Amino acid sequence: ATPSMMPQWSYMHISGQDASEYLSPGLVQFARATETYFSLNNKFRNPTVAPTHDVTTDRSQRLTLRFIPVDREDTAYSYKARFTLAVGDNRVLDMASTYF
Amino acid sequence: SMMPQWSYMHISGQDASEYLSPGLVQFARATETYFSLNNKFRNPTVA
């Protein structure tokens, strides 16, 4: 279920609200007032959670693909290679992560 | 052929947040942390 449905994880601040909110407003104003010479900013932990919907697939799909030269031709001083780069549907490829 | 050359290649014109469809802007703001699209678009500057 949702973590916020689980009570304990909210009680121990594993998941829930940040420390800017569940504190009574007076103490928050106090802490913001005296940050330069008496800091309370590290006496409370703020939870962080990661998204779980529509980020990562579940089908079978590889992370790294390796393509073979469809054609190669050679000479005395320089040689030429030619590949067929195939990008299947429902994917996007950034050319910054390709190398020979 | 409906735009002059300078305003086409974004040499001098609107910023990146002004010539993109709102959906793309919202998407780019959504996933900036782990998959960035910041550097694939221009941002003209003028004096």
Partner: protein, 49 residues
């Protein structure tokens, strides 16, 4: 332009860069098609010198 430099006993090259604007716009309308537009000013391609 006129340059005056120190003499040396070896053939040499004066290497000059004119700073210009060079840009590319890439557009991908349909599946498996990629089109481009290049531009470089004030030395437009095909009018170099």
């Amino acid at each position: 332009m006129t340059f005056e430099v120190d003499p040396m006993d070896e053939p040499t090259l004066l290497y000059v860069l004119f700073e210009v604007f060079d840009v590319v716009r890439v557009h991908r309308p349909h599946r498996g098609v990629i089109e481009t537009v290049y531009l470089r000013t004030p030395f437009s391609a095909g009018n170099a010198t």
